[PDB]
């Protein structure tokens, strides 16, 4: 009859026996090279021009563009739930404010600038991250500012980037991240900070790795996601430049990149941005019962904690804080 | 009137300029440092004990539980198309073949050994991949033959893993990748196919880095998630102990391990395997309409090759071997 | 007789003991001796006891003399940063699933060399009575 | 009964006796990677503009605030027993001679310049350093020229800095270990140094690396204790900025941190210095009989120099000039 064979073996070598340090539900707490806390999370805000808006996004998202007069509300639980930090995206709907050199985009009447002085008030115990592009607020649409009938006018993007840059700066905030990718403009945002006698109380957040694909809508300067060698000439570019920190997006699908910041970008706070795209994949999946969420949410996580960073830029964050917060 | 305000730059450093080397098209094909081909795409089949089966599974894929007889008809369309691999997957549904040791695994009348002599004859030119677990073969259904009422016995589980691993490759398979995660257990194959004068045409395909996440199924020796510095020492092991090349998986959540890999095992080939909780995501997402699937395929496995692996393990492998031929 | 510790006969009886708590329920076993290759032999008995993939070796890999203990055998010279490598090294080789280093504070550089050479092993820092008191 | 257990060993490896390279008392000076003498130690001085001062400071010390009229005998003794080196810190008491820009700080009539031409006279063998700080020469005693009713001024605070250290080399001292924190300062001093050509006589003591802790006294610029990553960047930019040597502080506190100093300055002397509050902690618990003061001075001393560091500025020095000269 068919009979199991068993071959004969060799005494067990005492190096291929790593079992025992990862046995005990507490030794993966203490296998983890970095354990995921609440002042990681950065909660993004998309502040809306119409101060009474609160409207919903969209693609799977539970997001919204909120307003100055909706805002003490939907952030003071967050904060209660112990919320330190919120990236700020303004979105002018009004009728007349987009154009050639995004002119509104430090306009003391913004909802960024207008939202900036909300929360140093408010609630002057968070810290303050603000997107620095003149993508939304550009007739065009375009990251920079434009030269006739083609591609970006390098130098005056810039000169005009670095404006806005400390202009919210002088505004209150604590940090601002260019999500532009146009070659040079950290060394012209530090140095303008430097003029502007800011650049020992901001917080330079670059965007040294943003990479292109269908996660951030579905279907410029934006690197190739199978460059890997220009990510890392591009993140040890930034860091030279004066960066403090550096952000790789997306996450989930950048996690060997984000592998590449840590060992390049060493001594600098890497931060790991959950796309838009992600996050409305991670729902999508957990309706069709192909993952719970939850259990996703976390693995997805710690993966960023154990790919390199120590910061994270995600739409879970309402949920991480009550979360963390349980034991058994 | 709220003027836009521009810094005072200086000129442009060469050093900051690396834009001119990801332009044009043909560019991003130029900074990959490794193009996607077909011989890479290696395709799982899940052999069942009932000659007439083709049974679809599910959770949101379009792959099956074929059987011998239905074998001819499945394989030869992809063939054409240029498939180089697959790695089997025996499913004995026998109401009476599973038990205390999996005796049934190496069975000469099973899915798997006659479906390594049906590949061998209509198809020469395959090359086979043996998945190596006692994991479907047990009455208990765990992956390795257990203790009283506790734990798997090492030694024992691992004197009978060895036994089949030889068993396929005296049969006609030419690769055996042992997905245990049992300790020692690459030492022991190894050991065996020398002593059965077959070491030197079987290559050995481990599963060193095989983490525990909501990806394989929905909700035994397996790896924590954040267990960064153990996934090393067990690649340094099985690498050491005579892996021929390395499996990484799940492979999108683990893609800053997959660089890991990639330092570590320098010189051995690794591969990346798209658990089919990723590939029932990436489906899932795209009827959705969060991302098309198509530009997420690429996308997702394209990070492989960029992360390190130039193989893959994937059910887009029918998709694939389409796709790569097309241009535009 | 009437002199130094009997290495073989002491690790012998040691990884006895180690054996013995696990098997008691322990989860993990910290073997405070420094008496050279004692931890080859404690995971080996682990092993022989089908004990090595529940317990945690975590082993006094760095374990230095002073004043820091109490007021006023086998164990490293303050001064020695060289021992204490080839002796961190050695029981990462020899088994080790985490390494301890004590005292801490006043061997915070030591801390840094097992952070480097045992960069795999979760590294464990132990305040002494004495840095306490 | 209980019997003993023992289990059942294999012959002891070569490679697990380490035990014959530190069994005799003198291989623990063999075993030593640098020896404690007394041209490494660095005594500190509290030089009073009350020419006659002598007045105890304390915490747990036995440092004073001497006056250029008893030098000479508190010298003395010290250098007789071969005291090579003194670092001076000026305290002046006069009722009129803070400020706005402490000026007072290179007064050529002052504590300081006033000591710094005594010691060049009355003993010429002893090399002096001079710690460069605007400190207690303000008003409000921060360190660094302010800006209105806020944060320190850099470039101004600096633009004086430089001024006085070059002020001091002018007067006669080998070295000027500035201790601000404020940045850039090295780059300017060492550019003040070579315009007034005192750059190849005197030797930028740089306190690269500077962190806040509770050991100065009870309870700006200055490093978090936690902040690792930026201690190797400020190590790594005084290097560059043309630092001679680095002072790590506190010490003993900080020994992993004067470890990334001797890998990444490594060409350059690395100083340890013994904080007060290092120095009356030892002293406080040496009182309280927890541990022996000389035996706890060399521990913690030779961490040092275990560590890292070939230079110590300790208030132990009076004492260690004594306990050097021992043997049995
Ligand atoms: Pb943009
Ligand atoms: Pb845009
Ligand atoms: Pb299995
Ligand atoms: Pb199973
Ligand atoms: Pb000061
Ligand atoms: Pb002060």
Redesign the interface.
């Not at 203490?30 to 090279?33: K, N």
């Not at 050199?101 to 009447?109: H, K, S």
């Not at 904690?305 to 390199?308: I, K, S, V, Y």
């Given at each position: 009859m068919?009979?199991?064979?068993?071959?004969?073996?060799?005494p067990?070598?005492?190096?291929?026996?790593?079992?025992?340090?990862?046995?005990?539900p507490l030794?993966?707490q203490?296998?983890?090279?970095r354990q995921l806390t609440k002042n990681m999370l950065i909660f993004p805000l998309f502040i809306s021009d119409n101060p009474d808006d609160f409207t919903e996004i969209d693609?799977?998202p539970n997001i919204n563009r909120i307003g100055v007069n909706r805002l003490k509300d939907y952030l003071k639980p967050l904060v209660a739930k112990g919320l330190r930090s919120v990236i700020l995206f303004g979105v002018p709907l009004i009728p007349g404010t987009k154009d050639p050199?995004?002119?509104?985009?430090?306009?003391?009447?913004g909802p960024v600038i207008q939202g900036i002085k909300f929360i140093r008030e408010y609630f002057p115990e968070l810290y303050i991250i603000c997107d620095v592009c003149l993508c939304e607020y550009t007739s065009h649409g375009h990251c920079g500012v434009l030269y006739d009938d083609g591609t970006i006018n390098?130098?005056?993007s810039?000169?005009?980037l670095?404006?806005?840059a400390?202009?919210y700066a002088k505004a209150g905030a604590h940090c601002v991240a260019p999500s532009d990718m146009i070659?040079?403009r950290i060394?012209?945002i530090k140095?303008?900070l430097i003029?502007a006698?800011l650049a020992?109380?901001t917080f330079v957040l670059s965007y040294a790795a943003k990479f292109s694909?269908?996660?951030y809508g579905?279907?410029c300067?934006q690197?190739?996601?199978?460059?890997?060698?220009?990510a890392r000439?591009?993140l040890e570019?930034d860091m030279s430049?004066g960066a403090d920190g550096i952000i790789v997006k997306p996450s989930?699908?950048?996690?060997?990149?984000?592998?590449?910041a840590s060992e390049i970008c060493?001594?600098?706070?890497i931060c790991a941005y959950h796309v838009s795209?992600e996050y409305?994949?991670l729902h999508?999946?957990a309706?069709?019962?192909?993952?719970?969420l939850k259990?996703?949410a976390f693995?997805?996580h710690?993966?960023f904690?154990?790919?390199?960073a120590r910061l994270i830029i995600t739409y879970l964050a309402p949920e991480f804080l009550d979360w963390l917060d349980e034991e058994n």
């Open positions: 068919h009979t199991a064979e068993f071959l004969e073996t060799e067990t070598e005492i190096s291929s026996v790593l079992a025992g340090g990862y046995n005990h030794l993966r203490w296998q983890s090279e693609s799977l050199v995004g002119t509104a985009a430090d306009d003391p009447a390098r130098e005056r810039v000169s005009r670095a404006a806005v400390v202009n070659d040079g060394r012209d140095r303008g003029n006698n020992h109380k694909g269908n996660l579905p279907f300067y690197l190739p996601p199978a460059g890997r060698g220009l000439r591009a570019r430049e989930t699908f950048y996690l060997d990149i984000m592998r590449d060493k001594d600098l706070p795209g409305a994949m999508a999946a309706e069709k019962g192909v993952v719970d259990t996703i693995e997805s710690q993966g904690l154990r790919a390199g």
